[PDB]
Amino acid sequence: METIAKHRHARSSAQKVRLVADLIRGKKVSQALDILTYTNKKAAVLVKKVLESAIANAEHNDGADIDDLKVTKIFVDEGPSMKRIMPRAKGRADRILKRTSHITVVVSDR
Amino acid sequence: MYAVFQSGGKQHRVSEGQTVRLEKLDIATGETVEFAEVLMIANGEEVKIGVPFVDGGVIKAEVVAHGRGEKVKIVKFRRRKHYRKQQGHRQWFTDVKITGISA
Amino acid sequence: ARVKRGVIARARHKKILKQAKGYYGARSRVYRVAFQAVIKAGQYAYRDRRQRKRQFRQLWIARINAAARQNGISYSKFINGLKKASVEIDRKILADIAVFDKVAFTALVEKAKAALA
Amino acid sequence: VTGSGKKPWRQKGTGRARSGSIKSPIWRSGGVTFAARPQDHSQKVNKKMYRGALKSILSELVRQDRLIVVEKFSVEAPKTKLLAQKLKDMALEDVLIITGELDENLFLAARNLHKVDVRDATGIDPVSLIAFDKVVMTADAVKQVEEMLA
Amino acid sequence: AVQQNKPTRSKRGMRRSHDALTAVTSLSVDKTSGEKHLRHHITADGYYRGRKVIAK
Amino acid sequence: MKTFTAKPETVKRDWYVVDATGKTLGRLATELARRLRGKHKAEYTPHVDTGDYIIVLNADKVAVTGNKRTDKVYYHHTGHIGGIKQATFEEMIARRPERVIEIAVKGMLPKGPLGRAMFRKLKVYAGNEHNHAAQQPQVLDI
Amino acid sequence: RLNTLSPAEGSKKAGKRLGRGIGSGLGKTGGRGHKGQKSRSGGGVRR
RNA sequence: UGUAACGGGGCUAAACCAUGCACCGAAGCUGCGGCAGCGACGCUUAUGCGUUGUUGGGUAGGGGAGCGUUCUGUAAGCCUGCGAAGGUGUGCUGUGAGGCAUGCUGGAGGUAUCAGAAGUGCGAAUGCUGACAUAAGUAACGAUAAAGCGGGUGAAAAGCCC
RNA sequence: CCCGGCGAGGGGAGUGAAAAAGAACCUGAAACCGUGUACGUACAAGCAGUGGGAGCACGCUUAGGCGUGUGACUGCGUACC
Ligand SMILES: [Mg+2]
Ligand SMILES: [Mg+2]
Ligand SMILES: [Mg+2]
Ligand SMILES: [Mg+2]
Ligand SMILES: [Mg+2]
Ligand SMILES: [Mg+2]
Ligand SMILES: [Mg+2]
Ligand SMILES: [Mg+2]
Ligand SMILES: [Mg+2]
Ligand SMILES: [Mg+2]
Ligand SMILES: [Mg+2]
Ligand SMILES: [Mg+2]
Ligand SMILES: [Mg+2]
Ligand SMILES: [Mg+2]
Ligand SMILES: [Mg+2]
Ligand SMILES: [Mg+2]
Ligand SMILES: [Mg+2]
Ligand SMILES: [Mg+2]
Ligand SMILES: [Mg+2]
Ligand SMILES: [Mg+2]
Ligand SMILES: [Mg+2]
Numbered sequence: 001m002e003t004i005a006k007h008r009h010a011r012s013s014a015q016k017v018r019l020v021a022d023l024i025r026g027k028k029v030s031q032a033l034d035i036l037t038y039t040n041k042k043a044a045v046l047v048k049k050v051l052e053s054a055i056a057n058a059e060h061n062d063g064a065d066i067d068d069l070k071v072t073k074i075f076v077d078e079g080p081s082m083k084r085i086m087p088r089a090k091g092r093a094d095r096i097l098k099r100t101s102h103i104t105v106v107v108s109d110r
Numbered sequence: 111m112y113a114v115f116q117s118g119g120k121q122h123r124v125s126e127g128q129t130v131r132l133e134k135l136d137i138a139t140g141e142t143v144e145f146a147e148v149l150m151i152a153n154g155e156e157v158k159i160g161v162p163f164v165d166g167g168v169i170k171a172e173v174v175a176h177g178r179g180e181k182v183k184i185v186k187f188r189r190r191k192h193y194r195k196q197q198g199h200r201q202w203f204t205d206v207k208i209t210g211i212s213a
Numbered sequence: 214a215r216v217k218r219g220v221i222a223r224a225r226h227k228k229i230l231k232q233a234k235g236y237y238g239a240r241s242r243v244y245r246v247a248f249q250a251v252i253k254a255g256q257y258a259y260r261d262r263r264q265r266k267r268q269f270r271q272l273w274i275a276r277i278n279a280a281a282r283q284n285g286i287s288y289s290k291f292i293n294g295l296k297k298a299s300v301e302i303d304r305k306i307l308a309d310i311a312v313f314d315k316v317a318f319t320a321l322v323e324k325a326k327a328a329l330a
Numbered sequence: 331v332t333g334s335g336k337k338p339w340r341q342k343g344t345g346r347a348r349s350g351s352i353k354s355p356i357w358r359s360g361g362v363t364f365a366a367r368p369q370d371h372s373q374k375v376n377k378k379m380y381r382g383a384l385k386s387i388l389s390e391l392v393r394q395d396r397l398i399v400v401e402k403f404s405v406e407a408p409k410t411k412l413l414a415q416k417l418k419d420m421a422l423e424d425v426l427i428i429t430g431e432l433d434e435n436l437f438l439a440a441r442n443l444h445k446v447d448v449r450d451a452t453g454i455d456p457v458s459l460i461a462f463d464k465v466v467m468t469a470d471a472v473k474q475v476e477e478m479l480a
Numbered sequence: 481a482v483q484q485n486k487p488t489r490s491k492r493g494m495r496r497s498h499d500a501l502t503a504v505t506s507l508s509v510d511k512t513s514g515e516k517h518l519r520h521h522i523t524a525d526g527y528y529r530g531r532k533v534i535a536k
Numbered sequence: 537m538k539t540f541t542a543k544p545e546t547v548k549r550d551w552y553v554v555d556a557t558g559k560t561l562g563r564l565a566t567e568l569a570r571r572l573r574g575k576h577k578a579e580y581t582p583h584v585d586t587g588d589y590i591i592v593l594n595a596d597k598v599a600v601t602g603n604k605r606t607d608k609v610y611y612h613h614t615g616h617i618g619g620i621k622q623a624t625f626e627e628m629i630a631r632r633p634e635r636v637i638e639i640a641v642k643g644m645l646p647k648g649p650l651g652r653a654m655f656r657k658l659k660v661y662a663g664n665e666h667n668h669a670a671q672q673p674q675v676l677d678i
Numbered sequence: 679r680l681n682t683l684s685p686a687e688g689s690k691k692a693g694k695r696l697g698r699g700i701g702s703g704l705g706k707t708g709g710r711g712h713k714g715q716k717s718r719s720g721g722g723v724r725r
Numbered sequence: 726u727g728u729a730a731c732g733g734g735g736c737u738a739a740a741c742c743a744u745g746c747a748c749c750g751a752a753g754c755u756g757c758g759g760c761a762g763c764g765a766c767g768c769u770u771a772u773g774c775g776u777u778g779u780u781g782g783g784u785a786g787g788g789g790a791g792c793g794u795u796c797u798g799u800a801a802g803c804c805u806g807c808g809a810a811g812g813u814g815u816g817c818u819g820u821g822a823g824g825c826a827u828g829c830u831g832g833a834g835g836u837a838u839c840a841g842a843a844g845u846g847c848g849a850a851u852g853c854u855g856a857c858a859u860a861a862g863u864a865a866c867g868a869u870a871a872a873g874c875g876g877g878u879g880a881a882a883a884g885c886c887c
Numbered sequence: 888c889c890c891g892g893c894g895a896g897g898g899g900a901g902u903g904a905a906a907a908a909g910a911a912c913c914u915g916a917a918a919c920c921g922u923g924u925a926c927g928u929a930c931a932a933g934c935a936g937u938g939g940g941a942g943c944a945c946g947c948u949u950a951g952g953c954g955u956g957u958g959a960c961u962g963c964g965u966a967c968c
């Protein structure tokens with residue numbers, strides 16, 4: 001069983017997150033939990049919590065056995081961006097997008 | 111062993127059993143055509159054409175169905191001069207399987 | 214009688230874009246750019262069709278020459294010979310025997326060297 | 331288009347393009363370059379050409395045995411089911427039926443029968459005279475029309 | 481100063497070919513307690529090179 | 537049927553040797569040039585390297601004609617400041633004679649990738665011998 | 679038969695549409711050439 | 726700025742003159758197949774044709790003939806939950822604008838034909854409105870009055886509380 | 888029910904013809920951004936295509952040296968208004 005888990009509207013960029021996601025794609029779940037643990041980036045906690053949830057799903061909703069689980073697929077897409085306004089000198093007003101990500105993890109064995 | 115001959119306004123070299131495509135011939139969808147103007151025949155020793163066409167040379171083959179090739183776009187465009195016309199074209203052909211080749 | 218306009222709009226755009234498959238960057242992604250990229254390809258096409266016959270002829274020739282050169286003769290004379298040889302009309306592309314049936318080509322260098330003499 | 335005629339922004343100085351009225355047919359919210367107006371699509375049709383046309387289309391119905399003419403034609407009471415029968419009986423389902431002086435019963439019949447309508451002679455219009463499969467028309471009427479096209 | 485043409489998504493990527501993050505592959509196991517730790521770092525439970533230090 | 541086409545993975549080649557001695561540098565370069573480009577066979581494939589491998593003995597002893605031996609250009613620019621560099625035929629023959637046959641034929645071979653490659657088929661050597669015995673080259677003329 | 683009749687050959691003809699592309703025959707400039715008074719929306723000279 | 730006054734290599738002929746014979750060379754000419762326009766022959770006339778001669782670069786611009794869209798009639802008809810419109814592949818088709826078939830999606834509308842009427846076709850107008858790239862994960866986080874530690878609380882504490 | 892901070896978010900289960908209608912909810916196009924796969928790419932110079940074309944990877948018919956994706960190398964080649 002493939003079994004996935006995703007975090008939508010993550011309060012991170014995507015570019016920012018994709019970095020962490022990259023550290024992890026296609027590793028043994030067990031080791032991903034370590035890699036993630038020692039990565040000093042907001043995004044890590046985010047992705048970590050997804051992986052974990054994927055696992056608990058794949059463990060409680062399917063065959064399971066963490067030991068034989070690999071993050072076969074991980075991929076973060078982009079969420080909708082909260083637009084704000086930024087006061088700038090001389091009356092000018094700028095945009096600024098506070099962006100969001102759609103973090104997805106997929107954990108299986110085969 | 112092979113022969114070369116005029117057909118569609120162009121020449122082809124060929125063996126018997128072999129199929130070649132030519133400019134549309136007004137010949138029945140199945141009948142047998144004769145190409146009385148071959149201009150070479152081959153072996154370990156071969157007959158080039160003193161004049162054009164070897165003496166008593168002639169090829170046989172049956173028309174193996176007609177056709178139209180794939181479509182080609184004719185695009186014309188005169189940048190800055192407000193002009194362009196596009197026009198399509200296909201082009202008929204008939205195929206033959208070459209049975210003959212009598213030297 | 215207001216007219217929708219924009220489903221047939223889609224229509225064309227999709228059609229042009231279609232023909233842009235392969236073109237790099239926005240050449241295949243963005244209509245403005247696609248559309249130009251498409252139009253020129255049709256030009257380059259029209260052109261190269263006639264160019265095609267050119268390119269090939271001058272290929273056949275060079276190799277025919279290579280072959281006659283091997284047989285102790287320059288393309289020029291050869292072809293002149295073949296020409297003078299009781300007429301003797303027979304394509305340059307057809308003189309591909311040059312490539313495959315070598316002994317045959319050699320048999321022409323003769324039929325030519327002869328009438329040429 | 332409701333809204334002020336004030337210039338949206340200075341002619342020169344801002345990167346922006348022109349702009350004269352926020353009702354520019356090229357601007358959004360409001361415009362229509364040649365905004366339509368109620369119009370009278372009536373034509374003229376010369377009398378003699380109108381009479382010409384009927385006398386024409388008429389003639390053709392005959393050539394196609396689509397005009398079946400009859401002496402008198404009616405129904406003794408206002409009951410569609412009645413008209414329904416007469417028509418079933420005569421093998422008509424798509425009919426114009428143009429009566430002489432036009433009665434009343436016949437009228438309230440077919441006023442619910444889809445493929446049939448009843449007019450008097452002085453009625454009869456050109457398009458419908460074509461539309462229906464079969465036009466009936468009583469001899470009484472054929473007279474009124476005869477002299478109406480002279 | 482500003483670009484005159486828009487940079488490709490392709491060039492953008494190359495710029496980032498050096499932006500990848502490096503895993504760790506530098507973590508060890510305290511000899512006294514099972515503990516995984518950053519080399520030269522006190523353990524979660526408060527050990528280091530065997531030997532509980534840091535009471536708390 | 538589509539005309540023949542030499543495939544890279546099946547081309548002949550064959551080594552050869554030449555002594556470019558009293559030969560006029562350039563009337564020789566020309567024949568070299570063409571043999572590299574395979575212009576004497578089934579070159580019939582100008583998008584494929586079908587030439588042979590030729591090696592050139594005694595580059596130093598190369599013929600010139602007219603005052604060329606002492607009046608010849610030979611200019612490069614190092615790309616700096618104003619670094620134009622010039623040396624003369626005789627001066628080239630002094631340091632690295634082999635370079636002369638190279639720059640000559642290199643200017644008679646085409647543009648880029650292909651030509652660039654056809655040129656790796658031409659081993660020079662200024663002295664009389666060479667170390668390609670292994671390929672056992674057969675000698676030719678012109 | 680209400681859809682078998684038609685107007686006599688020639689009766690009702692097209693009607694220049696103009697401003698509608700190249701192949702159209704009068705796109706751009708809509709057949710009124712280049713610049714000057716006589717182009718221009720409402721550009722003319724009294725009788 | 727750099728060889729920089731044959732395009733290059735290179736040439737004593739690969740320059741120059743004379744003569745002769747070749748060859749290469751264009752969308753010119755020819756050959757084969759195909760379309761159209763403007764003519765007339767010959768077969769033979771609600772005339773198309775073996776045709777047959779000739780013609781078919783094109784801005785402004787004129788003339789001609791068509792495509793598709795929206796709405797009206799033809800339509801209480803034809804198609805359609807045994808799957809409409811729209812989206813999206815694919816195949817076929819016309820000289821082209823286009824057309825048809827069909828997988829997937831979609832899930833309720835669509836309309837042949839011949840006519841009728843136009844808010845009828847967009848890449849540009851520093852066009853209008855929305856969405857989204859770019860620079861870039863760069864500048865910057867708003868007075869250089871300043872922070873440190875222990876303890877708490879908390880899922881988490883440089884910023885909260887003591 | 889499960890992971891999560893008594894979260895957000897998500898996976899199950901169940902409802903429904905459909906959740907490939909889950910409430911930012913019909914259809915869900917384009918730009919723009921990603922994951923996977925095939926083919927290419929780290930000695931090579933320019934409107935990026937077009938003409939030729941090896942290899943590689945998948946459809947032809949019972950091989951016919953075709954088609955499709957890619958495209959080494961190569962002729963030509965300065966977008967549009
Ligand atoms: Mg911006
Ligand atoms: Mg409407
Ligand atoms: Mg695309
Ligand atoms: Mg030509
Ligand atoms: Mg208003
Ligand atoms: Mg005022
Ligand atoms: Mg001022
Ligand atoms: Mg600007
Ligand atoms: Mg309005
Ligand atoms: Mg009146
Ligand atoms: Mg960087
Ligand atoms: Mg030089
Ligand atoms: Mg030098
Ligand atoms: Mg070149
Ligand atoms: Mg007109
Ligand atoms: Mg015009
Ligand atoms: Mg005018
Ligand atoms: Mg103008
Ligand atoms: Mg004017
Ligand atoms: Mg100088
Ligand atoms: Mg010159």
Ligand SMILES: [Mg+2]
Nearest residue numbers: 752753754755
């Ligand atoms: Mg011509």
Ligand SMILES: [Mg+2]
Nearest residue numbers: 753754755756
């Ligand atoms: Mg001629």
Ligand SMILES: [Mg+2]
Nearest residue numbers: 756757758759
């Ligand atoms: Mg012809």
Ligand SMILES: [Mg+2]
Nearest residue numbers: 766767768769
């Ligand atoms: Mg006659």
Ligand SMILES: [Mg+2]
Nearest residue numbers: 195781782783
């Ligand atoms: Mg014309």
Ligand SMILES: [Mg+2]
Nearest residue numbers: 752780781782
């Ligand atoms: Mg012409």
Ligand SMILES: [Mg+2]
Nearest residue numbers: 797798799836
């Ligand atoms: Mg209709």
Ligand SMILES: [Mg+2]
Nearest residue numbers: 217795810835
């Ligand atoms: Mg509709």
Ligand SMILES: [Mg+2]
Nearest residue numbers: 792819823824
């Ligand atoms: Mg059509």
Ligand SMILES: [Mg+2]
Nearest residue numbers: 216218844845
């Ligand atoms: Mg409009």
Ligand SMILES: [Mg+2]
Nearest residue numbers: 222244847848
């Ligand atoms: Mg647009």
Ligand SMILES: [Mg+2]
Nearest residue numbers: 706848849968
């Ligand atoms: Mg325009």
Ligand SMILES: [Mg+2]
Nearest residue numbers: 015860861862
């Ligand atoms: Mg960015």
Ligand SMILES: [Mg+2]
Nearest residue numbers: 860861863864
């Ligand atoms: Mg920067």
Ligand SMILES: [Mg+2]
Nearest residue numbers: 861863864865
């Ligand atoms: Mg910086």
Ligand SMILES: [Mg+2]
Nearest residue numbers: 863864865866
């Ligand atoms: Mg900074």
